[PDB]
Design a protein around this motif. Sequence first.
Motif, mmCIF file in Angstrom:
data_model
loop_
_atom_site.group_PDB
_atom_site.id
_atom_site.type_symbol
_atom_site.label_atom_id
_atom_site.label_comp_id
_atom_site.label_asym_id
_atom_site.label_seq_id
_atom_site.Cartn_x
_atom_site.Cartn_y
_atom_site.Cartn_z
ATOM 1 N N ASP A 1 0.804 -1.216 0.000
ATOM 2 C CA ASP A 1 0.000 0.000 0.000
ATOM 3 C C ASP A 1 0.838 1.267 0.000
ATOM 4 O O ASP A 1 0.360 2.308 -0.459
ATOM 5 C CB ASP A 1 -0.922 0.024 1.221
ATOM 6 C CG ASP A 1 -2.255 -0.640 0.960
ATOM 7 O OD1 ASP A 1 -2.745 -1.359 1.856
ATOM 8 O OD2 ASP A 1 -2.816 -0.444 -0.137
ATOM 9 N N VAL A 2 2.070 1.207 0.497
ATOM 10 C CA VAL A 2 2.925 2.382 0.448
ATOM 11 C C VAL A 2 3.636 2.488 -0.899
ATOM 12 O O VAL A 2 3.558 3.521 -1.572
ATOM 13 C CB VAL A 2 3.914 2.348 1.622
ATOM 14 C CG1 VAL A 2 5.026 3.259 1.365
ATOM 15 C CG2 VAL A 2 3.229 2.780 2.879
ATOM 16 N N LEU A 3 4.321 1.427 -1.327
ATOM 17 C CA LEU A 3 5.203 1.484 -2.484
ATOM 18 C C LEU A 3 4.480 1.347 -3.808
ATOM 19 O O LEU A 3 5.151 1.340 -4.843
ATOM 20 C CB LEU A 3 6.271 0.396 -2.392
ATOM 21 C CG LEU A 3 7.373 0.605 -1.361
ATOM 22 C CD1 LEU A 3 8.411 -0.483 -1.472
ATOM 23 C CD2 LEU A 3 8.007 1.942 -1.571
ATOM 24 N N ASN A 4 3.156 1.206 -3.815
ATOM 25 C CA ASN A 4 2.411 1.277 -5.069
ATOM 26 C C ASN A 4 2.531 2.690 -5.630
ATOM 27 O O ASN A 4 1.958 3.634 -5.079
ATOM 28 C CB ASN A 4 0.953 0.901 -4.845
ATOM 29 C CG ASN A 4 0.202 0.722 -6.134
ATOM 30 O OD1 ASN A 4 0.797 0.650 -7.207
ATOM 31 N ND2 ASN A 4 -1.117 0.657 -6.042
ATOM 32 N N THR A 5 3.279 2.838 -6.724
ATOM 33 C CA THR A 5 3.598 4.164 -7.245
ATOM 34 C C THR A 5 2.552 4.707 -8.205
ATOM 35 O O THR A 5 2.614 5.888 -8.558
ATOM 36 C CB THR A 5 4.952 4.149 -7.950
ATOM 37 O OG1 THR A 5 5.186 5.427 -8.553
ATOM 38 C CG2 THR A 5 4.979 3.075 -9.022
ATOM 39 N N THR A 6 1.607 3.881 -8.646
ATOM 40 C CA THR A 6 0.558 4.381 -9.526
ATOM 41 C C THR A 6 -0.489 5.159 -8.743
ATOM 42 O O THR A 6 -1.205 5.986 -9.318
ATOM 43 C CB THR A 6 -0.088 3.217 -10.276
ATOM 44 O OG1 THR A 6 0.915 2.245 -10.597
ATOM 45 C CG2 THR A 6 -0.721 3.698 -11.574
ATOM 46 N N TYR B 1 0.882 8.795 -3.322
ATOM 47 C CA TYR B 1 2.217 8.219 -3.331
ATOM 48 C C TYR B 1 3.222 9.241 -2.835
ATOM 49 O O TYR B 1 3.180 10.407 -3.232
ATOM 50 C CB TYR B 1 2.601 7.753 -4.731
ATOM 51 C CG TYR B 1 4.017 7.258 -4.825
ATOM 52 C CD1 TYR B 1 4.381 6.045 -4.269
ATOM 53 C CD2 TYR B 1 4.991 8.006 -5.466
ATOM 54 C CE1 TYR B 1 5.672 5.589 -4.350
ATOM 55 C CE2 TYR B 1 6.285 7.557 -5.549
ATOM 56 C CZ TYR B 1 6.617 6.349 -4.989
ATOM 57 O OH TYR B 1 7.907 5.901 -5.074
ATOM 58 N N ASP B 2 4.144 8.798 -1.984
ATOM 59 C CA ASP B 2 5.071 9.726 -1.404
ATOM 60 C C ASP B 2 6.356 9.020 -1.001
ATOM 61 O O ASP B 2 6.308 8.097 -0.168
ATOM 62 C CB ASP B 2 4.445 10.401 -0.191
ATOM 63 C CG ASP B 2 5.011 11.771 0.067
ATOM 64 O OD1 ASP B 2 5.994 12.142 -0.601
ATOM 65 O OD2 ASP B 2 4.476 12.483 0.942
ATOM 66 N N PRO B 3 7.498 9.412 -1.572
ATOM 67 C CA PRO B 3 8.773 8.807 -1.170
ATOM 68 C C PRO B 3 9.150 9.053 0.276
ATOM 69 O O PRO B 3 9.822 8.203 0.868
ATOM 70 C CB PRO B 3 9.779 9.461 -2.117
ATOM 71 C CG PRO B 3 8.982 9.805 -3.298
ATOM 72 C CD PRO B 3 7.644 10.216 -2.791
ATOM 73 N N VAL B 4 8.726 10.162 0.882
ATOM 74 C CA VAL B 4 9.060 10.381 2.283
ATOM 75 C C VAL B 4 8.177 9.514 3.177
ATOM 76 O O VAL B 4 8.609 9.059 4.241
ATOM 77 C CB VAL B 4 8.975 11.884 2.617
ATOM 78 C CG1 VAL B 4 7.591 12.437 2.364
ATOM 79 C CG2 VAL B 4 9.441 12.175 4.032
ATOM 80 N N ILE B 5 6.966 9.191 2.718
ATOM 81 C CA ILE B 5 6.131 8.213 3.414
ATOM 82 C C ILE B 5 6.746 6.824 3.302
ATOM 83 O O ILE B 5 6.760 6.046 4.270
ATOM 84 C CB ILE B 5 4.694 8.269 2.858
ATOM 85 C CG1 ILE B 5 3.926 9.423 3.492
ATOM 86 C CG2 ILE B 5 3.940 6.977 3.061
ATOM 87 C CD1 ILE B 5 2.553 9.635 2.908
#
Lengths: 59, 121, 243, 372, 42, 72
Positions: free
Chosen positions: F55-60, F64-68
Amino acid sequence: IVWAVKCLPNGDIVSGDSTGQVCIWDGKTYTQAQRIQSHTQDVLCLSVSADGSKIISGG
Amino acid sequence: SAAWPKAEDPALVQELLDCVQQASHYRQLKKGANETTKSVNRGTSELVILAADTQPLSIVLHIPLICEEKNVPYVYVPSKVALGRACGVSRAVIAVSLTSNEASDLNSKIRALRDKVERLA
Amino acid sequence: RRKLRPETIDIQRTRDIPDTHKAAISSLAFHPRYPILLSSSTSSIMYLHKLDASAYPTPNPLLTSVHVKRTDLRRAAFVGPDGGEIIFAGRRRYFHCWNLSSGLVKKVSKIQGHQKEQRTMERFRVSPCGRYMALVASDKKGGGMLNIINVGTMQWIAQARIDGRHGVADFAWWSDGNGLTIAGRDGQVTEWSMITRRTVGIWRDEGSIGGTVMALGGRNGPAELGGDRWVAIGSNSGILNVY
Amino acid sequence: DAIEVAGKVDDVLLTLNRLTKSSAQIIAYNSKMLATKTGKLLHTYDESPQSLRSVAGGRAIVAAAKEALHIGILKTKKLASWEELAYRFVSFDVPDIISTFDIRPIIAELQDIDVAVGGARGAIYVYSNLLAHLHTLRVGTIQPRKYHWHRRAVHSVKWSGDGNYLISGGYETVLVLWQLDTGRVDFLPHLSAAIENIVVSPKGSAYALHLDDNSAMVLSTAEMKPSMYVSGIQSLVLGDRPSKDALVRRVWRPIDEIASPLVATISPQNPSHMFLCVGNGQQATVGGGATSTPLVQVFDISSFQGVAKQAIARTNPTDVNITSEGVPIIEPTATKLAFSHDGKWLASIDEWQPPERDTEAYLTGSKTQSDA
Amino acid sequence: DTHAVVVAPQRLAEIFNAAPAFAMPPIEDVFYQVASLFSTKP
Amino acid sequence: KRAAVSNKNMDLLGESADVIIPTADPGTHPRGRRPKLKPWQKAFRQGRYAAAVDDVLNTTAPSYDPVIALTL
């Protein structure tokens, strides 16, 4: 969804349902006497001992 | 006994009396045995609900003959006092007959209700 | 006060309560010991008044005026024969118990595993013995239950479930304090005991298309049904039957 | 206990004294009998005994071995003379290593007892009726009801008042309440430290908790807020009673040790207060092989109460205390903490490295797990 | 303990209006009718 | 929708009244904004790390947030 009902020898009705509960229903009045929260998913089958001493519930 | 299309299930009895109360507010209802007989004979009646708590039960038994001749569904509820204060009468009503019209949510409810009565029969 | 005759009553209008509410009055209650009236409105205010028609400079003077923050007050009741605690509640999912000695107000917010079943605490009844308190659980679904709570420890001790169409119209504790009579909608009335903790019996109101309220009172009734003589059940048509 | 000797109820003391290391004996004393230091011997049992409790009155006493449990009923009714103070004892083996137990009496006679044995593997075994099972050579089949929620050992189990609820508390910092009339369970989950001891009030209203970080909170029921809070110094202690989950050989067995001195400054501008570094609990501090003290507390010296507490390093009280494998998590320790000249600044250092068991995949050449 | 008997007056008017003054039942029988109307026995 | 007495008029009548019982627990928001948990935070808190990382690393996804992702 009441997946399994069965009847105790003294008259009560034991019923496992969609919440994973096991309800004990009174035999003369047909009202519930107990709700036992036992399972997480739904109780699919019940079994009652022949002398009415043990209840097995499988979910 | 003679009340063979009996409505014994309390869910169906509650549905019948709720539709009777809605038709009573719509003024689409004929209350009483004589007015029920007139509506069934004239053919304006969509469904007809008799009561089984009538103390001489034979005073409403003529309506099953006219409903068998005119092909309208009749059903028996348990309590005439419940039927009476379902219509909103403050008397005991032993037979009631609820009619149909062109287009209503009530007419859709009438069609579903006579389908449930045909399920009883 | 005399014993009253069955056709005319010597009722007599006295000096009304001076402080009015800013909304409808949801609940009135009298103290079981002293002549003290507790009124509670939907405007989040409870008023305690002392009944003194011969008072000065204001008849029926106010003792205290408690505003509860953010809760509309749907019901307020005294607890026990001594009238020691006031339990009050509204639409919200918590109810307060205010002790009249030592003044502490505790906010009960958990019903011990049945917090999903209770989305309100508005309708409740404290037993006449003061030991128990029953709350109708907001779960209608063709039959209503009510969770029963020990008053002294505020913990769930039982649950009484009746079958209806929209749930529980009203209910009333028995006069000895053990069981309770639960009148549901669509006419089914259920006597449910506390000792055996299952249903004593079910009967039907005469011709009720749906119940609205019930009350239960008198003395010298049946000994195994609480010892209250009369039950009065009022339906949604306007007809009230007394059994 | 308060028992009736002839017609005068008085205190009887029931001591549990060792005779060898894994055996012990229970010995009763009056006050005048304690003055002459001879005691009425009642039982000697021979499997590393832990503790002794008794019901109201002096009718049934319950002794606890490591795996076994000894129930004893007094032989005669009404206790005519003192020389006939004899208890008939029946021993039976509990399925787990007994950490604690609470007995409730089912009653002005003593009809039955209900025993709740909290074992060291995590379970709580409720033996429902005992005097009517061992009153009757032959006995019927007795079978405890198992209530398993705690991962580690359950530190305290108590029945609650009327007997509807079974309140309990373990290492997982959660007060749990077994509903026991239904099958349900409701809990007060995120305390500061491990629930090391509970009691119930004389009335049903209050609970009182001894939390592992040197604290006691009298809670009220269903308000569930501490109506009385008392805190201590919370520093690292070499405990007398060692640990309740050091009985069953875990992954990291908890050791009573002090590895480093306590990090503490008396604060200028208010010299009665003392800032000092603490963890969540004492056992949760020393668990994991390293001091994990990511908090400070201000502690009053002139009147010895812990005034306040705050987090310095990152802490998660609302997350799970233990990993999925079973090791307690370590939190960043505040190693160096020293206070400014003014009374208005404070500088701390906190270090954290991952545990040695965890690396296992960063090793390439001569790199050991300590180096990683 | 007892209370005052409540009786609708139409029942007593029926008791006396059942017949004219002449050719009415004798006054013992009419007294028993009125007394059984005003009798507080459940 | 329309309440009988709104919360601001309840506040005014509480100013007029005698004794005020606060029903918010002290140290919380008075209007009652609790920090609700995003489902990756809920899964991480319960210990469902596979669902948390997915649920975090799903980039579509638009949330979406790299700091999250670094936080988790």
